């Protein structure tokens, strides 16, 4: 018998006691990046037919990075609060299961839930835990992770521009990554979080004070 | 070459179909016809034309030059295959077999085109070949062959966006949908008039504007007319140079009914003397009249017949026999009284009228599958 779809602990972010209760006005001095990710994620989610009609190839997934304490988690809290679509929110160092196969199945059923569920949104944190550079085929602990990256690298390619499934990925070190993850068709938008100097800084002072 | 190639067929119309009008067409069509090496497509047009027995040597110097380009294709096809750039014989006649499309007939065109279609692995030349087949399918009106390469055309634009190959294509589907009497689709392909371009075939952008307004005025209703063509600046500034067309549009929108028949007789007269509209010029104004009659007549219920001669258009007996044949034609929803001199309207439901075309298509398809049902199984 065939089954209705099913996945692990990231069930939909149940939306009642699940908002991180953060407003857009809580983040001060991030007009470029907030307006820019507003262009990047939910503007194709609603106004899809302009991306289709003008035909400008809307981005599949987005990468965001920088020094820590620059709003990486908080921006996802705000977008996850004011979103209207389904939101899928995993912690990216949980695919290292002790049993083999639970990793790759845990990869594919999440994207199956994003497929079946809604025009939804994927979030992954600490991508440095998976996407590295060097590998060693003598442990199995490394071979499992190699099989993780092959599976997610496949399942990102298993799309057809028709589903409105967006992947948001926040990390700290861009250096310890594979550019094969950063090839176009998978990733095209890379957002550093630099330091606000004075101008956006005083807005943060106004908001906190 | 196929970029000035439509004026040729328009002037074959201008030669053949207006009987009195056959002098300047055999002037300028010969002016273009025995130059730029044209040989094949005017022997039957020479039969429909005059004797022109002096043009035998004109055919000989140009079958000689046709032989020159032919034999230098025959000079290219061995160094072209000696070192292989990219099938360089078909790289020569991928530009000169379209010359051969103009110069020779469709056959040495088509085998070289279905030939050369397999050369360029990217569609940046394939879809141009398909455009050429579209244009010669228009010229010889190959109404089955246009259906093939329209689909084979459209199947190529989805990779890439290619809106200079999709809106440019919408020009072709617009000209075919106005070639046939499919006007609500013809204006729908004529929707943009913005991405449309200063063409090779409508070298006047404003002639394209006249075409899209002539098809729009039937193709769409008041709400559409009262937003789209009336508020477009890009459509307004081009009829800004048009004295009559701006009048002919605004005589209908501004309830100027009497001059609307005058300018209607003008545009209908030129349409009668127009290529590609001369198949349906009578079809045009028989819809224009009943359209305006629907417009004024679906306002009031007790408006009399004698009111319309002075404010609408002269001739009481003309309005008599004209509305009589339209109620008798089963449209124009009203019911005229005669010997008390008053015109009464009603309103029908959307039931029996919508029922009618359903029993039409039902009987039509019943005839279809009945006929095929006797075709198969002996």
């Amino acid at each position: 018998d065939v089954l209705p779809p099913e996945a692990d602990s990231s069930i939909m972010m149940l939306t009642s006691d699940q908002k991180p209760d953060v407003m857009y006005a809580d983040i001060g001095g991030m007009d470029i990046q907030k307006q820019e990710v507003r262009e990047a994620v939910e503007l194709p989610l609603t106004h899809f037919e302009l991306y289709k009609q003008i035909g400008i190839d809307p981005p599949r997934g987005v990468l965001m990075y920088g020094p820590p304490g620059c709003g990486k988690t908080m921006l996802a809290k705000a977008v996850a609060h004011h979103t209207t679509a389904a939101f899928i929110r995993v912690v990216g160092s949980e695919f290292v299961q002790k049993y083999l196969g639970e990793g790759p199945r845990m990869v594919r059923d999440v994207f199956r839930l994003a497929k079946e569920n809604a025009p939804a949104i994927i979030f992954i944190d600490e991508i440095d835990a998976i996407a590295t550079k060097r590998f060693d085929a003598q442990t199995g602990a490394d071979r499992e992770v190699q099989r993780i990256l092959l599976e997610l690298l496949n399942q990102m390619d298993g799309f057809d521009q028709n589903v409105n499934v967006k992947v948001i990925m926040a990390t700290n070190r861009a250096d310890t990554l594979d550019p094969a993850l950063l090839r176009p068709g998978r990733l095209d938008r890379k957002i550093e979080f630099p330091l606000p100097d004075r101008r956006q800084k005083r807005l943060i002072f106004s908001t906190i004070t | 070459p196929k970029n000035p190639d439509l004026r040729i067929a328009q002037l074959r119309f201008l030669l053949s179909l207006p009987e009195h009008r056959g002098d300047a067409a055999v002037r300028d069509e010969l002016m273009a016809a025995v130059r730029d090496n044209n040989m094949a497509p005017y022997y039957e047009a020479l039969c429909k034309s005059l004797d022109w027995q002096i043009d035998v040597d004109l055919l000989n110097k140009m079958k000689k030059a046709n032989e020159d380009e032919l034999k230098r294709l025959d000079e290219e096809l061995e160094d072209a295959e000696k070192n292989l750039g990219e099938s360089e014989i078909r790289d020569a006649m991928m530009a000169k077999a379209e010359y051969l499309c103009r110069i020779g007939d469709k056959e040495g065109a088509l085998t070289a085109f279905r030939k050369t279609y397999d050369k360029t692995v990217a569609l940046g030349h394939r879809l141009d070949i398909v455009f050429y087949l579209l244009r010669i399918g228009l010229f010889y009106m190959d109404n089955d062959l246009i259906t093939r390469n329209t689909e084979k055309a459209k199947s190529l634009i989805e990779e890439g966006g290619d809106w200079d190959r999709r809106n440019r294509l919408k020009v072709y589907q617009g000209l075919y949908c106005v070639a046939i009497r499919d006007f609500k689709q013809a204006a729908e392909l004529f929707l943009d008039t913005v991405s449309t371009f200063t063409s090779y075939e409508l070298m006047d952008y404003k002639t394209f504007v006249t075409y899209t307004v002539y098809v729009s005025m039937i193709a769409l209703e008041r709400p559409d007319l009262r937003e789209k063509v009336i508020k477009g600046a890009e459509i307004l500034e081009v009829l800004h140079s048009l004295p009559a067309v701006r009048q002919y549009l605004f005589s209908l929108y501004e309830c100027r009914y009497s001059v609307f028949f005058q300018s209607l007789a003008v545009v209908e007269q030129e349409m009668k003397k127009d290529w590609l509209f001369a198949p349906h010029y009578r079809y045009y104004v028989r819809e224009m009249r009943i359209h305006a009659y629907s417009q004024l007549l679906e306002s009031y219920r007790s408006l009399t017949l004698g009111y319309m001669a002075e404010a609408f258009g002269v001739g009481v007996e003309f309005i008599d026999q004209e509305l009589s044949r339209f109620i008798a034609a089963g449209r124009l929803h009203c019911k005229i009284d005669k010997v008390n001199e008053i015109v009464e309207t009603n309103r029908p439901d959307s039931k029996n009228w919508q029922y009618q075309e359903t029993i039409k298509k039902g009987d039509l398809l019943l005839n279809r599958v009945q006929k095929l049902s006797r075709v198969i199984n002996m």
Partner: protein
């Protein structure tokens, strides 16, 4: 095949409906208006 044992011996239809209603009526309906300007 296709023998017929012999004992005895778009482009057109919408146009043909134009002929069906307006078969022979007001062919050159161009000057009758200007002829009704003075009679009406």
């Amino acid at each position: 095949m296709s023998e017929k044992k012999q004992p005895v011996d778009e482009d057109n239809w919408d146009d043909d409906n134009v002929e069906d209603d307006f078969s022979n009526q007001l062919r050159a309906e161009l000057e009758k208006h200007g002829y009704k300007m003075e009679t009406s």
